[PDB]
Every structure is written in C-alpha cells, then in structure tokens.
Amino acid sequence: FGGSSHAKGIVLEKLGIESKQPNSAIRKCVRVQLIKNGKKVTAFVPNDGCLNFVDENDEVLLAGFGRKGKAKGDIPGVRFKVVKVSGVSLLALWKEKKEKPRS
Amino acid sequence: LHVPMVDRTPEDDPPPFIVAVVGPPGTGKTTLIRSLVRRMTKSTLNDIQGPITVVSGKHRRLTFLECPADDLNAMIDIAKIADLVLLLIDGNFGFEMETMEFLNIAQHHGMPRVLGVATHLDLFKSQSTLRASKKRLKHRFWTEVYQGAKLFYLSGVINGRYPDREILNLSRFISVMKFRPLKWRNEHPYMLADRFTDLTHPELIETQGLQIDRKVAIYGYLHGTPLPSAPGTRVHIAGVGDFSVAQIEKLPWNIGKLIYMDNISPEECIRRWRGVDLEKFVPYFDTFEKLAKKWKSVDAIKERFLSYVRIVFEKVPMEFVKNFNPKFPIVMGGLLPTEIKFGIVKARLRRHRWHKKILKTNDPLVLSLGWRRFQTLPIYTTTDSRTRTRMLKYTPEHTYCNAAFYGPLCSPNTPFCGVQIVANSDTGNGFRIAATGIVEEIDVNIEIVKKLKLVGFPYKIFKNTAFIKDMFSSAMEVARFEGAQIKTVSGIRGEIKRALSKPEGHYRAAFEDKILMSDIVILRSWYPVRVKKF
Amino acid sequence: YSTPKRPYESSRLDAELKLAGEFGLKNKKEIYRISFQLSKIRRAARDLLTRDEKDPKRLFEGNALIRRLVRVGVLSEDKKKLDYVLALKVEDFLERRLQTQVYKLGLAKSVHHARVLITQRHIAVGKQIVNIPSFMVRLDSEKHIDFAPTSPFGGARPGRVARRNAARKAEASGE
RNA sequence: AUAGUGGCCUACCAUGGUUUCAACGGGUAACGGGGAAUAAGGGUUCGAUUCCGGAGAGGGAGCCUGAGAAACGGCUACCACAUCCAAGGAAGGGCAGGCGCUUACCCAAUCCUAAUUCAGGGAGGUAGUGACAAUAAAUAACGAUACAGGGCCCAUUCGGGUCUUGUAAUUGGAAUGAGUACAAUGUAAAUACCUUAACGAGGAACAAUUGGAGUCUGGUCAGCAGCCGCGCAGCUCCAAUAGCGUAUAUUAAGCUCGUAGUUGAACU
RNA sequence: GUUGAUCCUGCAGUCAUAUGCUUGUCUCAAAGCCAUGC
C-alpha cells in the first residue's frame, strides 16, 4: 500500500491455488491491476471458492491482510484480500443477502 | 470507457430519454402519468395516448412508457433498455412473495436510476405510525438496494391530482439527475418504435390471405451505436422473431470514387486516373537491366534515411395482424456476427434468492439472452477434479453447476438470466425467477459423461486371490473386459484376470491390496449421453 | 460513565458475575456506572482528609456530604466519623436498588422475580408507580413499599388473564 | 450659506496654532462598542452581535415628498446593457435560490398601525429534519410428576479429589404491555403531548446478533506395488448484547597561537 | 585466600480514518453546474 487502508482495482485474470484440506479443492487467486498506481498486485479470496461470483474484467476493492505484510501460510507470498466487487461487499453476496449488479 | 463515449455525442433533443412507470395493476399509475404530463404541457391535458412523443422543449424531450403488471414478456423487455426506473408502491407490499420479483430482473440486466413513489399510504394510514413505516421501507428499499436514490412520498389525491411543488421535486429529480452507462446495451444499435403504419400495396388477392405479409413502415428515434449505415441488415422483433430489413429510410479523376465503380476495369482506373492476382505474393518488378541501370544512382531516396427513422419491412405474417392492439411497447434490437449462428454454449449458474424450488434437467427453462427469449432444456454438469467425471440430476443449494445447452451462440460472454415460466394466473408476476448466471464460454460439439455402476458386493476377500460373490451373469462379458482395470469406491484398483467359465459373479481378478468387508466393488466410465436439442 | 482500565482480567471478570448472580443485573454498564459515581465521591473524599481540622470546607462540604450518605441510606450512623467513607464498597449502592429491596422485604421469593414485578405496572413506593429498577430508596421510604391499589395482588380487578379464565368457564360449561 | 450661532465657504489684515509623565507618524488580518455564557477580573465565542453607527442596491449627474429619507424596498436624464416586433416602436435591471462541501399553517397571545372597541403586519407564533453521538428496558415469571445417572473439577499427562444431577409439551394456573380504539384535556382555528373504557401469549411464538475453536461427523484426491496405506451436509461449546467486526495508523519496557563565547582572589 | 559440583527459582490503549452486518418502543443526531422565478 501507499500507507492508506484500501485500493480499488480491476481484475485481469484468474489464477489457480489449491489446498490439501478437506482434499484437493481449489482456493484460487486473482490478478488485479491498481487503478491509481498501475502496479500489479495479487490477492486471495477467503471463502469456499467464490471465484464464481466475481468475473474477468470487473471492479474490485482490495484490502490488507493485517499482519504488517507477512503472508498467512502455504499460499505463496500473497498479502492482500478482497472485500467489495461492484460496491456490494462479497460477504453479503456470500450468504445470500444481496444480488450482484450487472457489472 | 469508449462504449459510454459513443452514446452521448449524437444524443440530443429529438432522441428522447427513456422513462418507465412500473408497478402493480391496481394502483393509479395512469393518474400519476396524467399529473406528470400536466406539468409539461400547460395545465390541463389528462388524456393518455401512450407511447407518445413528449416534446419537453429544445433542452430535453422525453418519452414515457407504462406496461401492465401481468405481461411476462414486456416486463423483461422494458428492463434492459431503460434509463430511469420509476416504481409506484402501495401500502401493502414488502413480503409479498409473488408480486415483486421483477426487482431482481432490473437488478441483473442493468440497473438504471430507480425511484420509490408512495401514494396509497394516506387512505390506509391515519396516524403517526406511518412515519416509522416509511422509514422501515427506507430500511428495505431503495436505500438498501442502492445507496444514492431517493424514496418519494406523495399525497393520495387521486384523480384531481396536484400540479404543485411535489412534482417540481419529481421533475427536479427527473430534470437534473441523468443516467449511468450500461455496458452491453451501448454496443448494439437499438430503437423504440413511435408510430406504426401498415402498407398493404392496395387491395388485391395477393394482399390478404392465410400467409400474406405486407410492407410495414415503422417510425422512431435512434439509441446506442448507429443503425443506419447500410441497407439489408438484420434486426429482432421482440415476441415475433428475427428478421432482416428490406429498405431503411433516414430522417434527421478521383480514384476513391472510381475504385468503387465496378463497371470500370482496374486498368481503366489506372488509365483514367493517370496517363495480377494475390496468388503471387512477391510483388511485380521490372527487368534487371531496367532496375539495375535505373538504380545505378541512389539519390532519389536520400531523404529516406537519417435521429428519426422511416423503416420499411416486408414482414410480419398475417397472424400478427389479428394480434393487433393498443401499443403495448415494442422494442427493436440488433444482432451481431457470431450471434446469428447457433451453437452449444457453456454457462456458469447458481440458485436464486427469494426462489423456492429445485431444477431437474428435463424441465425446460425460459432464458433471456440479450434481446432474445428462448425456451431451452438446461442440462447441468460438474467437474470434481478439474476434469468431468459426472453430471447431476438437480442443481442444489449444496453445489452450483456448470450448465450447458444448445441455442443461439453468444461469444462476448453476456450475463444470463433464467426465468421459470408460469401462466397469466399463477403468482402475480408473469414469470418467477429460477436462476441467474453468465455465459462462460462458447463450445460446439461437447459431450457430457455420466458414470454408471455395475455392482458387486464383497463378503470375504484377499488381495491376490480375489473373487466377487454377486456381480455378473455372463461369461463373455468378463472375457471382453479381461484386458481392463476395475475399482472399488475405497480407491484400491483391480484388474480382472480371467472369467474361469463361471458366469455366477465368482471369477478371478486382481487388487493391489485386499479390499475390505464394508466396501463396494464396482466398475466405471459409462456411456457419454447426447444433448437434447430444442 | 467511564470504562475500567482493563477489560479482561481474571479475578475481576469472575467478580462481575458474583455481583450479577446475587443482584441479578443484565449489563456491566449497570455495574460500571455505579462505580463511576463512587469514583467521583471518593476523590472528593480524599480531598477533605488533607486539609485542616474543623475547616468550614471540611464542615459544610464535608458533613453535608456525610449526611447525604446517611440520607441515601448507605452510611450507618455509627460510622459517622468521615473515616468509614474510604471504607465504602461497591455492593452498598447495589444494595440500595429498588429491585433488591423488594426481595429483602419478603414478597418476591427471588431477585429475578422482583425484576419482572417492576416492569409490569406493579409495586409503588409512594403514590407514584415506579418501573425503573434503580430507583435508589432513601431509607425514609422502606415501609411504604407495597402492592398497588390497582394491578392485582392488590385487588379490585383480577386482570385480563384472570378475567379471560373466568370467560372460558361461562361459555363452555355455562352458556 | 443653513433650521441655527460657527473658516462651514469667500475677499481683506496678521504670521500664526499643538508637543517630553509625550502632539503627530505607524502595526494589531477584531468592520465598532454596551452587552450574553465558562465564570480568576488574564482569557474563549459573537462585534455578521439582542441596542445602534459607516458601506451598496447595474455605474453615473440632477431633482422630489414628509416634522423626521439624501429615500433606490422615490422620479428624470446619461452610460454599459439586453427582451419583443405586426419592422412603426414599445420595455426590465442582469438578480436571487439550490446543488456540487421536498417547506406549510395562523394573527389566539406581545407590541405596532388603522379611514383606529372591526382589521392588518414578508413583526410575531405553530408542524417537516435523526447511529458521529446518546437515552431508558421488553423478548418471559412461579409451581407440579413420572421416568434416569459413568455427574462435575484438577494435573492436555502417569493419575487424583469431590457425586445433590438432567433429560421428558407428563402438566397447571398466574402477571403484563408492544400494538388495535371512542371519549375528554390541549386549542395558533389548531396539530402533536398529559389521560383513557374496548381488546390482547404457552410458543409456528408477538421471528435478536455479530463473532470465535472443533485433536469433532461425512464425499468419487499425488500417484502407484512383492504387502500394508497416505492428503457446501450431522451437531456441540465459548462471548457481549441492540450492539458487534474488519483493514490502516497509533501508546507502554597531527602540533601551537588565538577571536565570538563561557567562567573566575580576598577586604574597612 | 582460590577451584568445581548439587538444590532453589526466572527467562496491550486509541475517536483515530474508511468499511460490513442488524436494531420492536421512547428521547436526542466555489472565478463550476443548474431545479426554479424576474
């Protein structure tokens, strides 16, 4: 980050990150270019999948992980996590409490 | 960023602004339309000829549209082309499970600016408790569905309705706040019809019959990317079908001309303009004496180094003449290359919120793709290992499928809305929303696999010297699969040795352990069934 | 009010619920605000222990502060020497609550049953019906705490559920 | 000259008038004070002030009424300056208001005016607007019986100490207001507020939550032998409570001379 | 006056910025663009 708390960005593509628990189920990562700086930053989406929701080529809101850097575990060196696509807050789309906009 | 850029520049006062009034059939929508146009034209015009051209000055002319709440098609057709949603509500909606599902359609196909209008909350409410109920609606909608919209509250002053400052607030929000761009709408030419004339090439036995379609001249204004560029292009008529246009009319020494004049040979283009085939790639040159003697000196390249439309149709057939009516609004689309084709399409789905069912693969589903509404059988499949090894029987809350079906193909991966159809007297909405998703990719000639199961139940097993007690009855089957590899759901594979002339289930096979006594010993990979075409 | 200095600390956290167990509260907010008023008095209590003997500040702002503690019904009059004021503790303001004084005076058979009897338009102390459990009785109002003229357990109406029980007998058994 | 004494203005004559416990010149971004709150009087805020004084009503010169105007919320003319045109001519002064960070009713009181014991007042008074905050407390209280116990704590241990326990609508009467509604008080005519008969519970109830762990239960996955393996759905427990998180920041363990400069005996 | 071993013990605060979820009752929260009117 540049010191602030968040950064809004654009999906370019969808990667592949797997897991060992419960078995080999895909945990994924996404590729987001920064709008304001142009640096290209990876991120992780903590849930059961939810790669299905977002899309290629849409507007996300990146957020910190809360460890002063310091990636969590066996996902390799990923430092940031995703909160809002299209302004409607993925967790609310996760339960069922919202339906996503057109784009 | 450029898709919004192509839209705004030709748009000016004769291209109108799209406004729909959507709501329940019982409430006075028509009264709000009359009192709304009472502000625009001077003070007294309270007669509805909708849709009609509302000349609101030289700054911004508009056109207003209402549709009844029982029509299943045009409720969808109005949702994707709108620029302002004006919803009229009653004092009796909010957990009505069958009347307010169109909210999700406007949610998914593109939401413009929306409005809540409260009118019957005065004949029903009489006390201070209406203030908490209005704020309760503000907790529900529209402040929760979009942050940045205004919930309006108006008096119940039904016919006899006010001209005063409250529709100056309504015409304040209409007059000031403009539209946000819709992505896949502005990449298409699309036009609303305004006037509608029927030209029959006057009376003859080849003018009326069972099969006769006549020359329909239709009239309106343009929206989106420009449609008049060329005659004979394609078009879609909603509810009726896809057609081409016959003839479109529009009402808002030079080599570059001689090349397009095809009565002239190209040597006469070169001949007139001054003074043989692409199967030879290497271009033409002259002789080595001419290029050599001509290019002895190299000085010659020394600087070379450092609006309104009148649209003609030959359509539509005679049976739609008997479906003539007051103009319940009709919209024209425009189909693109790689979407006039047919093909099998692969699309990501999930289950829909405020929906109360499950979806088997055999019940057909009504799908809205862009401008086209089509009934198609939604066969589902899943992978479980980044490769497919099964399909499913109905899409659950548990998993969320990869749906595949056959119809028109749509390359640009559009969002994808799926309505379960009901009749005109089942719920209170003309459809009810089954599922929603997105076109993931286009893929013709794909083949689903469903792995069935030949069954053998174990009882007393060892590793090398392995029988199954109860699995078969034919010997030649095992004679054919003796060159194969068998299994068990536990995951320790086997390989059948020999049938041993016992077609009783008992025969010798192989396992790379001894399969346990609470297992199920089976065989895999069955017939890859076809796709239902419709 | 004021939050305490440490939010989670073992010997104090369990000391919360043994106050919530006897008195029957619902929020430590209703514990902390009580200590907050006991905080402000006690700072003032140490101020008049520094100054001179028979200071009129120690007289007028001392003894009236002492008598007000006798007036609220907390300082017993035998300890009226301004040296028990430091020896005050938390439960004595909790003891003077309107909820707990009901149970002490028979009539409630619980501290939780009396909580329900406060908020149901029952027991008054003067001629004013009290329905806030923290009414802080002033020790001149103890033997006026009694069931209301209305609201049965006090008579002259049996009430909407007793009248409905009377209503059921007349319609099926009688007519 | 004016309503009026008067260098206020004009001609003559004289060369004068102020000032060292201080004339004049000059800074205080506070347009000025009396005043209103916290109450050291020092200070903060307002002085755009509750009372008044200076400025300006598109910019100009002239002119008026009234005892009281220098009237612009009076007039003529000049100058920039735009609106209509039947093409002769006629006309207003470039203004407010709002966003960018939806405004109504009434003179019943006070006082003022009145063609004045009538009524009026862009004087005056009465409703719209609400998690940055914050305020009280409801979501249940008390009885009863038959089945039944390997129930709980400490050392994650090896093991030890203390057994007063719950599952069943078994089941019964209590008690209430959230809300539904005449009446009256209020009365700018008047709205709300202070009151109120009439209703109103055995859990589908009259529908709290955001969290957190958990060596728990389930499903067809590298990759394969001489034999044996590996990696969404069932609940349980813990937390504050109409409040609870998340991200960023934040608090606690080379030699010597010599200037500015600094410091330095005693004593009638 | 000078060499070793054994035993005991020890090695969170923020009104401070944005954002997410739910709240039955009560009280208190420009020198840009124009809706409009002369």
Side-chain angles (χ1 to χ4, degrees), chain A, chain B residues 1-252 254-305 307-534, chain C:
Chain A
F1 286 158
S4 64
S5 68
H6 300 91
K8 188 172 75 173
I10 295 169
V11 168
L12 292 181
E13 64 182 358
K14 295 185 286 185
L15 298 180
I17 290 300
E18 64 185 5
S19 62
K20 293 186 287 184
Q21 304 296 321
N23 284 313
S24 174
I26 316 165
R27 298 295 172 273
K28 283 86 170 174
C29 281
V30 296
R31 288 295 294 271
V32 174
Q33 186 178 2
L34 293 174
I35 294 172
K36 68 176 181 178
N37 292 323
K39 291 182 182 179
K40 180 67 179 175
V41 183
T42 72
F44 186 77
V45 182
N47 254 314
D48 194 4
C50 296
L51 191 75
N52 305 321
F53 283 165
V54 282
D55 278 328
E56 295 181 353
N57 294 314
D58 291 334
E59 178 176 357
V60 302
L61 189 273
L62 297 180
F65 192 79
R67 302 288 185 89
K68 187 73 177 179
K70 304 299 187 292
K72 190 266 295 294
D74 48 355
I75 60 169
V78 181
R79 299 178 297 174
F80 300 93
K81 69 183 181 183
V82 184
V83 175
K84 293 174 72 176
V85 298
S86 298
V88 298
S89 179
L90 270 302
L91 194 277
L93 292 179
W94 186 69
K95 295 178 181 179
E96 68 172 359
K97 289 185 184 293
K98 193 62 61 65
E99 289 181 352
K100 189 175 180 180
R102 89 294 298 275
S103 293
Chain B
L1 303 176
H2 185 267
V3 175
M5 187 269 176
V6 298
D7 184 74
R8 271 74 173 176
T9 300
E11 281 175 353
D12 46 1
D13 184 71
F17 185 80
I18 305 301
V19 171
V21 174
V22 181
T27 59
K29 302 173 71 171
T30 60
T31 303
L32 190 274
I33 298 165
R34 290 183 289 113
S35 178
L36 184 60
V37 303
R38 186 178 175 182
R39 186 259 179 188
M40 293 298 169
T41 318
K42 294 176 182 177
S43 66
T44 52
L45 293 182
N46 289 317
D47 183 74
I48 297 169
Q49 300 299 111
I52 205 164
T53 299
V54 178
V55 182
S56 179
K58 197 176 179 181
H59 176 69
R60 291 293 300 166
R61 295 178 194 174
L62 275 73
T63 302
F64 291 157
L65 294 167
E66 67 172 356
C67 60
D70 293 329
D71 187 81
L72 77 176
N73 285 315
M75 188 177 288
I76 289 177
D77 297 331
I78 197 62
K80 54 177 174 289
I81 57 170
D83 290 332
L84 179 68
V85 170
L86 194 146
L87 179 65
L88 176 60
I89 63 170
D90 200 78
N92 287 313
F93 288 97
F95 192 75
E96 291 290 325
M97 308 288 282
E98 292 179 354
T99 62
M100 300 301 289
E101 289 289 327
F102 58 94
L103 305 174
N104 300 319
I105 298 166
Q107 173 60 255
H108 294 157
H109 285 279
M111 188 180 289
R113 301 294 186 180
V114 298
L115 283 175
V117 172
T119 55
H120 287 172
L121 202 65
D122 295 326
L123 304 178
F124 181 71
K125 296 295 292 183
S126 67
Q127 298 176 356
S128 69
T129 55
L130 59 88
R131 292 184 181 180
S133 296
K134 180 184 175 185
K135 296 293 191 291
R136 183 182 294 167
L137 296 176
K138 188 176 179 181
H139 284 286
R140 282 186 180 267
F141 61 94
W142 288 95
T143 306
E144 191 177 5
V145 181
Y146 177 66
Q147 291 296 325
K150 302 293 184 182
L151 177 59
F152 279 171
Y153 181 69
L154 302 178
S155 180
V157 63
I158 316 168
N159 52 359
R161 188 176 290 267
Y162 63 91
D164 64 1
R165 295 182 181 92
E166 297 174 352
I167 55 168
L168 194 144
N169 191 8
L170 182 64
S171 66
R172 194 270 305 274
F173 187 80
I174 291 169
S175 64
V176 173
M177 288 73 171
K178 295 294 183 183
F179 61 99
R180 285 175 289 175
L182 183 54
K183 179 254 185 66
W184 61 273
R185 181 176 62 188
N186 294 120
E187 291 178 353
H188 298 83
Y190 65 102
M191 165 262 178
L192 181 61
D194 296 329
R195 265 72 180 177
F196 177 74
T197 60
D198 301 335
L199 296 177
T200 63
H201 297 94
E203 176 67 29
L204 190 64
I205 60 172
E206 202 71 26
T207 57
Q208 69 271 13
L210 181 62
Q211 299 294 324
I212 307 300
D213 49 350
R214 278 87 72 195
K215 180 174 73 175
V216 176
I218 208 159
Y219 303 102
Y221 290 95
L222 295 172
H223 301 283
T225 58
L227 185 60
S229 61
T233 181
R234 297 289 298 166
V235 77
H236 175 75
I237 302 172
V240 175
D242 299 328
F243 297 96
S244 178
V245 67
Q247 179 66 41
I248 189 168
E249 295 177 354
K250 185 170 73 175
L251 183 69
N254 194 0
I255 190 67
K257 297 180 182 180
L258 292 176
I259 286 170
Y260 291 103
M261 291 181 180
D262 294 332
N263 55 1
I264 302 168
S265 66
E267 65 182 4
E268 186 63 30
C269 296
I270 301 297
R271 184 175 176 87
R272 287 170 187 260
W273 179 56
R274 66 106 177 86
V276 71
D277 194 359
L278 299 179
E279 304 300 324
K280 181 177 181 291
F281 175 75
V282 178
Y284 179 75
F285 292 93
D286 294 333
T287 65
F288 175 70
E289 186 176 1
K290 189 181 289 184
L291 298 176
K293 184 179 179 181
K294 183 180 177 182
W295 285 105
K296 287 179 179 292
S297 179
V298 292
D299 292 330
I301 57 169
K302 71 173 71 174
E303 293 85 2
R304 293 294 291 147
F305 289 159
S307 295
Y308 190 77
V309 292
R310 298 178 183 174
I311 300 171
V312 171
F313 285 105
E314 290 291 326
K315 306 301 179 184
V316 299
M318 186 62 203
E319 70 182 7
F320 289 104
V321 181
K322 296 179 181 180
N323 291 116
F324 283 169
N325 51 356
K327 278 87 177 64
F328 293 154
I330 303 298
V331 65
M332 295 298 107
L335 293 175
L336 303 185
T338 68
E339 285 181 351
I340 198 166
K341 297 170 69 172
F342 285 169
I344 308 168
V345 60
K346 185 177 179 180
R348 176 182 292 166
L349 267 76
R350 62 181 178 86
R351 193 260 191 87
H352 178 69
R353 175 252 187 87
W354 295 107
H355 186 81
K356 301 293 179 286
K357 285 187 177 183
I358 53 171
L359 292 170
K360 289 185 181 181
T361 62
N362 294 322
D363 202 6
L365 190 60
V366 178
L367 301 178
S368 175
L369 277 82
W371 286 267
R372 298 170 72 181
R373 61 105 186 97
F374 277 147
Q375 180 181 3
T376 311
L377 294 162
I379 295 169
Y380 307 110
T381 188
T382 61
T383 173
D384 58 349
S385 175
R386 305 188 189 185
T387 177
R388 61 190 65 192
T389 58
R390 70 183 297 182
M391 62 189 286
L392 295 181
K393 288 189 280 189
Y394 52 89
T395 299
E397 183 69 27
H398 183 74
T399 54
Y400 297 101
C401 293
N402 291 322
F405 59 94
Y406 174 73
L409 199 68
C410 291
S411 297
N413 306 112
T414 70
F416 170 68
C417 296
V419 288
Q420 175 63 46
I421 189 167
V422 295
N424 299 112
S425 67
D426 291 333
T427 60
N429 293 321
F431 287 105
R432 190 168 179 271
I433 311 299
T436 308
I438 180 171
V439 172
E440 186 180 4
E441 65 179 358
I442 59 167
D443 44 355
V444 298
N445 296 113
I446 71 165
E447 288 84 5
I448 197 165
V449 173
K450 177 184 177 182
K451 295 186 188 296
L452 280 173
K453 185 181 285 187
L454 282 176
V455 182
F457 293 114
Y459 293 93
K460 189 169 174 65
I461 316 96
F462 299 106
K463 173 179 185 294
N464 285 318
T465 67
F467 283 11
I468 303 300
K469 288 187 181 178
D470 297 325
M471 194 160 184
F472 290 103
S473 68
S474 300
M476 190 60 205
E477 293 170 350
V478 186
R480 293 182 291 123
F481 281 163
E482 65 185 4
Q485 297 170 355
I486 75 171
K487 303 293 183 285
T488 295
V489 299
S490 297
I492 292 167
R493 301 192 294 265
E495 292 174 357
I496 289 170
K497 189 180 264 77
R498 185 167 182 258
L500 203 68
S501 298
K502 303 204 293 291
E504 64 180 3
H506 299 285
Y507 62 93
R508 60 180 180 175
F511 285 97
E512 59 169 358
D513 274 333
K514 52 184 292 292
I515 302 297
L516 272 57
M517 285 174 278
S518 72
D519 293 339
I520 302 172
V521 183
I522 56 170
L523 189 56
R524 303 295 299 267
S525 292
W526 290 89
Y527 56 96
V529 78
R530 294 291 187 268
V531 181
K532 301 177 178 70
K533 267 73 177 178
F534 195 76
Chain C
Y1 65 96
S2 177
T3 179
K5 188 180 184 294
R6 289 184 181 271
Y8 297 100
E9 191 177 1
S10 293
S11 67
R12 190 183 58 84
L13 288 179
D14 287 332
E16 294 176 352
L17 58 95
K18 287 180 185 176
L19 297 175
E22 179 181 359
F23 290 94
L25 301 176
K26 69 179 289 182
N27 293 315
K28 67 189 74 60
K29 184 180 288 184
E30 290 188 356
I31 299 171
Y32 290 162
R33 187 184 64 188
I34 300 299
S35 68
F36 181 74
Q37 297 176 359
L38 193 144
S39 175
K40 298 182 289 181
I41 294 167
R42 194 173 182 86
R43 267 86 55 81
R46 298 179 298 171
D47 293 331
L48 295 173
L49 262 297
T50 68
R51 294 172 65 88
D52 191 73
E53 291 176 349
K54 302 297 289 292
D55 193 11
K57 191 179 193 297
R58 189 171 176 177
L59 290 176
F60 185 77
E61 287 182 351
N63 294 320
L65 181 59
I66 291 169
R67 286 191 302 274
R68 197 177 75 232
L69 290 175
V70 184
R71 185 173 178 181
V72 296
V74 178
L75 176 63
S76 67
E77 57 89 17
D78 287 330
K79 274 88 173 61
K80 196 180 291 181
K81 73 276 193 182
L82 49 289
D83 293 334
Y84 190 70
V85 185
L86 300 173
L88 260 292
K89 65 181 186 178
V90 180
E91 293 86 7
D92 289 332
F93 287 157
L94 272 297
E95 185 67 28
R96 300 300 296 162
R97 294 184 68 249
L98 191 272
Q99 178 180 358
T100 172
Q101 289 297 107
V102 172
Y103 173 68
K104 303 290 285 190
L105 202 70
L107 197 147
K109 76 266 195 185
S110 166
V111 302
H112 285 161
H113 179 74
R115 175 62 68 91
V116 189
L117 291 176
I118 292 169
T119 188
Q120 288 182 356
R121 301 292 300 274
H122 285 85
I123 305 102
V125 176
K127 64 100 176 178
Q128 179 69 42
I129 291 173
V130 176
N131 51 0
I132 298 169
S134 179
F135 187 74
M136 296 300 172
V137 187
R138 183 250 177 268
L139 183 59
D140 287 340
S141 297
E142 288 181 346
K143 289 184 260 74
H144 299 87
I145 300 166
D146 194 78
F147 284 152
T150 64
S151 73
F153 289 105
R157 289 178 71 189
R160 72 176 66 89
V161 66
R163 295 293 88 196
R164 194 262 310 281
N165 287 317
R168 291 178 180 176
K169 181 175 68 68
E171 54 89 18
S173 297
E175 298 90 5

